[PDB]
């Protein structure tokens, strides 16, 4: 019982650290997306810089 909780706590520590980094990255990306949507970018959409569409 003590050993089961210890193993679960170690695994949850690793998983929670990875998840914190992942959702922090998503939060920053969402911040950039929100800032880009309140900007006149859709009216001023740039051409594609690559030969692919």
């Amino acid at each position: 019982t003590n050993l089961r909780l210890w193993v679960a706590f170690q695994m949850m520590k690793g998983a929670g650290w990875a998840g914190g980094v992942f959702f922090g990255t998503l939060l920053l990306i969402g911040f950039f997306r929100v800032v880009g949507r309140m900007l006149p970018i859709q009216e001023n959409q740039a051409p594609a810089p690559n030969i692919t569409g």
């Binding site: 193993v7 170690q10 520590k13 690793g14 929670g16 650290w17 990875a18």
Partner: protein, 45 residues
């Protein structure tokens, strides 16, 4: 096969469990993203 427990006599269990949790979360997120990119399995649409 009945001697696999000796893996805990070579690698420190405390660090192995943390690394395993990191692996499991990252793998789950990767698979979920791959499914999310497919139109036939995008549960958010």
């Amino acid at each position: 096969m009945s001697k696999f427990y000796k893996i805990w006599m070579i690698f420190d269990p405390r660090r192995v469990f943390v690394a395993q949790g990191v692996f499991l979360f990252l793998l789950a997120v990767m698979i979920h993203l791959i499914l999310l990119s497919t139109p036939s399995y995008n549960w958010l649409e």
